User: Which sequence fits this backbone?
């Protein structure tokens, strides 16, 4: 029987990429990936 | 002798090509700086000099 488990995680985590910031349509040879990384990691409750 | 950057502002300031070049020149400057990912979790983080 279908039984699920959901330990409470807010929607702000597990971020998907939509519209812009696709990391594919974005220019290589001029974009640094660090900016997204720093922003994504902002939601982590503790050091990573 | 100290500058406080909000993370978006620091990302904007780091995006420039020339400010990266101030670190890579052999004799241009003496700017030790960690322009990569560092200290993601904590609040205050020191980025070189």
Assistant:
């Amino acid at each position: 029987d279908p039984v699920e488990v959901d330990m409470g995680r807010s929607e702000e985590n597990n971020i998907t990429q939509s519209g812009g910031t696709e990391w594919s349509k974005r220019d290589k040879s001029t974009y640094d990936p660090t900016d997204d990384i720093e922003a994504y990691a902002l939601n982590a409750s503790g050091v990573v | 002798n100290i500058i406080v950057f909000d993370p978006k502002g620091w990302a904007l300031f780091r995006s420039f090509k020339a400010v990266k070049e101030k670190l890579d020149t052999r004799r241009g400057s003496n700017s030790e700086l960690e322009t990569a990912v560092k200290d993601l979790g904590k609040a205050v983080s020191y980025k070189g000099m």
Summary: Chain B touches chain A at residues 7, 11, 14-15, 36-37, 39-42 (CB under 8 Å). The first helix of chain B runs from residue 7 to 14. Helices of chain B lie at 7-14, 17-24. The two ends of chain B are 9 Å apart (CA to CA).
